[PDB]
Amino acid sequence: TAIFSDRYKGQRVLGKGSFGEVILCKDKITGQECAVKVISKVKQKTDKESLLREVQLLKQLDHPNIMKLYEFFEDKGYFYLVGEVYTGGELFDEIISRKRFSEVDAARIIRQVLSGITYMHKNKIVHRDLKPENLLLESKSKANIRIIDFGLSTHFEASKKMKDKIGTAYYIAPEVLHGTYDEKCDVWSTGVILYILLSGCPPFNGANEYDILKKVEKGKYTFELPQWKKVSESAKDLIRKMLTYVPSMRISARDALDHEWIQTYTVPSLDNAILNIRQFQGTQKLAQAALLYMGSKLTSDETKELTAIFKMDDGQLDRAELIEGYKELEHEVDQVLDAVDIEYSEFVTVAMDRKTLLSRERLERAFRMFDSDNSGKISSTELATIFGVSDVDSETWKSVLSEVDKNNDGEVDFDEFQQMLLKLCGN
Ligand SMILES: Cc1cccc(-c2nc(N)sc2-c2ccc3ncccc3n2)c1
């Protein structure tokens, strides 16, 4: 009965989310700001009665390391999950900005994650999809960590699209892959995050999604990297208990809080681990940005559908007709007409070019951030890692690279990298 739009109004986009987009919304009466995830009816893993009883329980739970869920709405085409706003950004984006990072800083982070998990397991809730992207900070500083999507992510079907799958294979418990899993899968995922905090490298890695999942399924890893020599044996011992293969023999979330490592450490800088987490995060973010650029190019579909609507027609249209044309597919129309002042062809051309330039700018920021030595280029070896994480076939991107520039000599600048992505999405 209760309608979302009768209570909240959208303000601005907050970012991407699993199963849906996240919008900053404001209560039309009290002015309370809220984070709203909009899930487009994404298949349902359970019946409607199971989702209602889970949401009812989740709304009553309260922990400082768990995101607060306020409301839940549903209409013919979407589900709306209304919760609290956390403005500190993603945890790993904060870690890469720091000059120093020690074993105390890592233990302080992992104590908060484990506190949240222990509390949710007491209430029979399983996350399953715990990963760095679901660890948000209340403020942008070295701040309380809030775990996102705890108990919600499992009621919806996992997206098969690589844009949503990037940064997930590293953290999934092996038993989740084979189908029989319980709350112990959340301890495995935290054990993987702890391994990355102390070395900057994932324990289970590979050239592509499937190669990572093969390493996870075997469950073998090592502490044989120069970084690990500067880490205590108490940290390595906790990681071993957390990354125990058989779930019944794996340590509980509660017993991990009571581990000597967490009690002792909650301080030499792990310099090589910071350099590696920066490279890891840069790679993940540029692969995501590359997929969202290709996604936005195919969507901008919008240019073809808007032309067939604007039926509505001298090669010219009034201001009100252009507003009606956009609403079928007010301030945004005036910003396009400002650069012009009109013909409907020049309006769509100026509006499309405005969305193209802004799409190019988000990709460019990710490219610049990946290019940490400010060389202006990325090597063929770096392209192989980026296209590996984004699941673009080796022969396909190498052919496209030769088409863009026959004399590339194993490197690409931003313009060339952008040209490669256009050809990889039919442009
Ligand atoms: C169930 C639910 C409801 C509303 C949002 C989300 C949510 N899911 C994600 N995967 S990121 C996110 C979130 C939360 C709060 C945020 N606050 C400020 C910026 C980005 C944010 N993003 C989950």
CA of 361 to the centre of ligand 1 (A): 24
Ligand 1 atom 20: the closest Cα is on which residue?
14
Regarding whether 59 and 139 lie in a shared domain, the answer is: no
Domain boundary among 279, 296, 314: 279
* In a shared domain, residues 231 and 330: no
CA of 59 to the centre of ligand 1 (A): 15
Write the DSSP assignment of 276-308 as a string of letters: HHHHHHHHHHHHHHHHHHHHHHHH--HHHHHHH
- Are the beta carbons of 67 and 86 closer than 8 angstroms? yes
Give all strands of the β-sheet with 69-74 in edge-to-edge order.
Answer: 8-17, 20-27, 33-40, 78-83, 69-74
Residues 226 and 253 in one domain: yes
Domain end call among 254, 279, 304: 279
- CB 165 within 8 Å of CB 209: yes
**Residues, the chain, total?**
427
Q: Which amino acid is at 386?
A: I
Report DSSP letters for 323-352, one per residue.
Answer: HHHHHH--HHHHHHHHHH---HHHHHHHHH
DSSP for residue 156:
B
Q: Which two tokens stand for residue 35?
A: 């984070």
227 is an annotated ligand-binding site residue: no
List Cα–Cα distances, 422 to 92, 398, 411, in angstroms: 29, 14, 17
Q: Which of 421, 144, 131, 172 is nearest to 280 (CA)?
A: 131
Q: How many domains does the chain have?
A: 3
Residue corresponding to tokens 């490219």: 367
φ/ψ (deg, to 5) at 20: 175, 175
Measuring CA to CA, which residue among 297, 299, 291 is closest to residue 397?
291
Q: How many CB atoms lie within 10 A of CB 314?
A: 6
CATH for 125: 1.10.510.10
E strand intervals along 78-132 = 78-83
Q: Are strands 135-137 and 145-147 parallel, antiparallel or unpaired?
A: antiparallel
* Ligand 1 contacts CB of residue 130 (under 6 A): no
Q: Is 84 exposed, middle or buried (CB count within 10 Å of its CB: 0-12, 13-18, 19+)?
A: middle
Resolution of the coordinates, Å? 2.0
- Extract the tokens encoding 197: 């905090």
What pairing do the DSSP bridges indicate for beta strands 411-412 and 378-379?
antiparallel
Q: Are residues 12 and 72 in the same domain?
A: yes
**Residue 250 one-letter amino acid:** R
CATH number at residue 79: 3.30.200.20
- The SS3 assignment for 70 reads strand
User: Would you say the CB of residue 151 lies under 6 angstroms from ligand 1?
Assistant: no
Distance from C-alpha of 180 to C-alpha of 198, rounded to nearest angstrom = 30
Assigned token pair, 211: 């190669």
- Breaks following residues of the chain (C-to-N distance > 2.5 Å): 41, 142, 266, 300, 310, 313, 329, 341
Please choose from 67, 90, 159 the residue to mutate so as to test ligand 1's pocket, defined by most ligand atoms within 8 A of CB: 67
**Which residue in 341, 347, 342 sits closest to 326, CA to CA?**
347
- The CA-based angle 83-84-89, given to 5 degrees, is 120
Same domain, 300 and 313: yes
| Centroid of ligand 1 to alpha carbon of 22 (angstroms) | 6
How far is the centre of ligand 1, averaged over its atoms, from the C-alpha of 34 (Å)?
9
Q: From atom 19 of ligand 1, which residue's Cα is the shortest distance away?
A: 14
SS3 content of the chain, % helix, strand, coil (to 5): 50, 10, 35
Tell me how far apart the alpha carbons of residues 105 and 51 are, in angstroms, rounded to a whole number. 37
Rounded CA separation 250/135 (Å): 23
18 backbone dihedrals φ, ψ, rounded to 5°: -80, 135
How far is CA 253 from each of CA 112, 197, 245, 306, 331, rounded to the nearest angstrom? 11, 18, 15, 53, 51
Token pair 């890891």 in the structure block, residue: 280
Bridge partner residues of 12 (DSSP): 24
Residue 291's contacts (CB-CB under 8 Å, 6 or more residues apart) are: 162, 163, 166, 390
Say whether both 12 and 78 belong to one domain: yes
Ligand 1 pocket: which of 12, 19, 21, 22 to mutate (most atoms within 8 A of CB): 22
- The domain boundary residue, chosen from 279, 298, 330: 279
Is 99 assigned a ligand-binding role in the annotation? no
- CA distances to 66, 119, 120, 177, 348 from 183, in Å: 16, 12, 9, 14, 52
Active site (catalytic) residues: 129
- Contact assessment for residue 117 and residue 127, using Cβ atoms and an 8 Å cutoff: yes
| Residue 12 vs residues 6, 73, 182, 293, 296: alpha-carbon distances, Å | 18, 19, 37, 20, 18
Main-chain dihedrals φ then ψ at residue 156, nearest 5 degrees: -110, 155
Claim to verify: residue 118 and residue 232 sit in the same structural domain: yes
Contact 257/114 with Cβ under 8 angstroms? yes
- Residue indicated by tokens 């199971």: 50
φ and ψ of 407, to 5 deg: -110, 45
Three-class SS state of 400: helix
Q: Same structural domain for residues 124 and 192?
A: yes
37 among annotated binding-site residues: yes
Are 71 and 96 found together in one domain? no
Ligand 1 mean position to 205 CA, how many Å? 27
Looking at the fold, whether 94 and 82 belong to one and the same domain comes out as no
186 is in an annotated binding site: no
Decide: 38 in ligand 1 pocket, CB within 6 A.
no
Burial 384-407 (b: 16+ CB within 10 A, else e): ebbbbbbbbeeeebbebbeebeee
According to the entry, how was the structure determined? X-ray
**What is the residue with the minimal CA distance to atom 6 of ligand 1?**
37
Distance (Å) of CA 237 to CA 18, 251, 254: 32, 11, 16
Residues 6+ apart with CB under 8 A from 364: 414, 418
Q: How far is CA 15 from CA 89, 395, 407, in A?
A: 10, 32, 38
Nearest CA to ligand 1 atom 15: 85
179 and 258 both lie in a single domain: yes
Residue 369 near residue 361 (C-beta atoms within 8 A): no
- CB-based contact 250:188 (threshold 8 Å): yes
Whose structure tokens read 């076939």?
A: 393
DSSP string for residues in 25-48: EEETTT--EEEEEEEE---BSS-H
Does ligand 1 have an atom closer than 6 angstroms to the CB of 14? yes
Work out which ligand 1 atom sits closest to the CA atom of 86: 17
- The best mutation among 8, 92, 148 to test binding of ligand 1, ranked by most ligand atoms within 8 Å of the C-beta, falls on 148
Judge whether 189 and 176 are in contact, CB under 8 Å. no
Q: Is 321 annotated as a binding residue?
A: yes
d(CA 57, CA 123) in angstroms, rounded, equals 9
Residue 24: strand, helix, or coil? strand
The answer on whether 375 is annotated among ligand-binding residues is yes
Domain containing 8 equals 1-87+150-157
Which of 8, 11, 14, 137 has most ligand 1 atoms within 8 Å of CB, for mutation?
A: 14
Q: Which of 73, 253, 279 is nearest to 196 (CA)?
A: 279
Q: Answer yes or no: is the C-beta of 24 below 6 A from any ligand 1 atom.
A: no
Same-domain pairing of 300 and 245? no
- Distance (Å) of CA 274 to CA 105, 189, 266, 352, 386: 12, 20, 20, 40, 20
Measured distance CA(217)–CA(213) in Å, rounded? 6
Q: Which string of b and e fits 96-114 if b means at least 16 CB within 10 Å? A: beeeebbbebbbebbbbbb
Is residue 149 in contact with ligand 1, taking CB distance under 6 Å?
Answer: yes
370 CA distance to ligand 1 middle (Å): 25
Answer whether 15 contacts ligand 1 (Cβ < 6 A): yes
Confirm whether residue 6 is marked as ligand binding. no
C-alpha 153 – ligand 1 centre gap (Å): 12
